[PDB]
């Protein structure tokens, strides 16, 4: 196509005791008036938890702007390790470049630092760029 669109939106603990193949893990959680923490439960695939030293584990991407915005870009070209968001961006930009769509504009909802961190992965323009994240990426043909 001559122009594509992509939309992004992504949302992203301390101590998790893990027991009993699934995980019945229990941990303190915070509610009420800044003090009282009711200890809640949940669950978690072994892939979703990280070990660290009894047996107590904790939660293992890291940054949420690129989570979403990466889902924006990659949601555009009809396409759809973890420890580096930057890489997975240069990965997404690799696919799109390898299809011909030059990134159009990208909106973002230390700002200068963050943009320059993106422009390094996209090689785009500073004057193009500007916890929860919703992000949008526009693709243009070159």
């Amino acid at each position: 196509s001559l122009i594509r669109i992509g939309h992004g939106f992504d949302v992203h603990c301390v101590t998790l005791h893990c027991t009993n193949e699934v995980r019945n893990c229990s941990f303190n959680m915070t509610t009420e008036l800044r003090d009282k923490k009711q200890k809640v439960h949940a669950l978690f695939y072994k892939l979703d938890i990280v070990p660290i030293e009894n047996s107590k584990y904790r939660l293992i991407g890291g940054d949420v702007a690129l989570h979403a915005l990466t889902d924006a870009i990659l949601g555009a070209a009809a396409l759809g390790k973890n420890a580096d968001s930057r890489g997975l961006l240069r990965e997404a930009f690799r696919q799109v470049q390898e299809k011909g769509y030059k990134i159009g504009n990208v909106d973002i909802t230390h700002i200068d630092a963050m943009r320059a961190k993106i422009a390094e992965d996209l090689q785009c323009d500073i004057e193009q760029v500007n916890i929860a994240c919703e992000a949008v990426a526009l693709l243009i043909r070159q």
Partner: antibody, heavy 133, light 109 residues
Framework: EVQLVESGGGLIRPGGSLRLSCKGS????????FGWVRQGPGKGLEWVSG????????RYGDSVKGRFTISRDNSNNFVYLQMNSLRPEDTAIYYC??????????????????????????WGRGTLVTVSS | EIVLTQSPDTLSLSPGERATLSCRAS???????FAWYQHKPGQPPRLLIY???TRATGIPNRFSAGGSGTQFTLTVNRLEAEDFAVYYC?????????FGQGTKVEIRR
């Protein structure tokens, strides 16, 4: 509703071992700490041990450090006291007792349901242990 | 190891009177980290007080306690018949947690 049933009593020689069990009912067992208290002949209450909800934090009276080991089984809702290297002076009635259902860290934050053993609001009817040769 | 010394070792009182207990601590407890128990011969002990004077479950307002530093007292405003028994203080400011040696309240004749 709330009750605590001890078991495992009997006569053992000095140097022997013995295992006590305490079954709790009528409340959410997993949330509470537990402790053990004994009374020797003609003595008062003496603090022996305590452990928190998952047995991860266990500590002991100075006079019992080393010889006594506390454990718990949250899977089957049992708490245990493994008593090794028993001596005559340890002869006493042993009471199982329920601790608190909250605790407080060095930051003043209160943790509901993560019980510990500061004090005991529920006490078993007690099981006699006699250590003599 | 915290050593607790109570007084008097036992009390001779009569129904309707007020009883005042005493427990001396060797080192400084934070007033709110003190408990008191009641024990009659032939029955399991029952918790009366935690948190210094927060009433334990089932404990009537007739019982009150307090103190600070190295001396703490319990006061029973008006003794009744069921109240004649042995009473123990307990500190949980520093491990090992320790009990006082008990003070007995008996029937005066």
């Amino acid at each position: 509703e709330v009750q605590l049933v001890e078991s495992g009593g009997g006569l053992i020689r000095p140097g022997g071992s013995l295992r006590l069990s305490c079954k709790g009912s009528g409340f959410i067992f997993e949330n509470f700490g537990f402790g053990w208290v004994r009374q020797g002949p003609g003595k008062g209450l003496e603090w022996v041990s305590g452990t928190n909800w998952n047995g991860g934090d266990s500590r002991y009276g100075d006079s019992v450090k080393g010889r006594f080991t506390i454990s718990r089984d949250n899977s089957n809702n049992f708490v245990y006291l493994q008593m090794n290297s028993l001596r005559p002076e340890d002869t006493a009635i042993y009471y199982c007792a329920r601790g608190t259902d909250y605790t407080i860290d060095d930051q003043g934050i209160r943790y509901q349901g993560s019980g510990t053993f500061w004090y005991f609001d529920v006490w078993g009817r007690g099981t006699l242990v006699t250590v003599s040769s | 190891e915290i050593v607790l010394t109570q007084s008097p070792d036992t009390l001779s009182l009569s129904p309707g009177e007020r009883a005042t207990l005493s427990c001396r601590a060797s080192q400084s407890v934070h007033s709110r980290y003190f408990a008191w128990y009641q024990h009659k011969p032939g029955q399991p002990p029952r918790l009366l007080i935690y948190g210094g004077s927060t009433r334990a479950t089932g404990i009537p307002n007739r019982f009150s306690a307090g103190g600070s530093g190295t001396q703490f007292t319990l006061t029973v405003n008006r003794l009744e018949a069921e109240d004649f028994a042995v009473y123990y203080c307990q500190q949980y400011g520093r491990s090992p947690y320790t009990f006082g040696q008990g003070t007995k309240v008996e029937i005066r004749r």
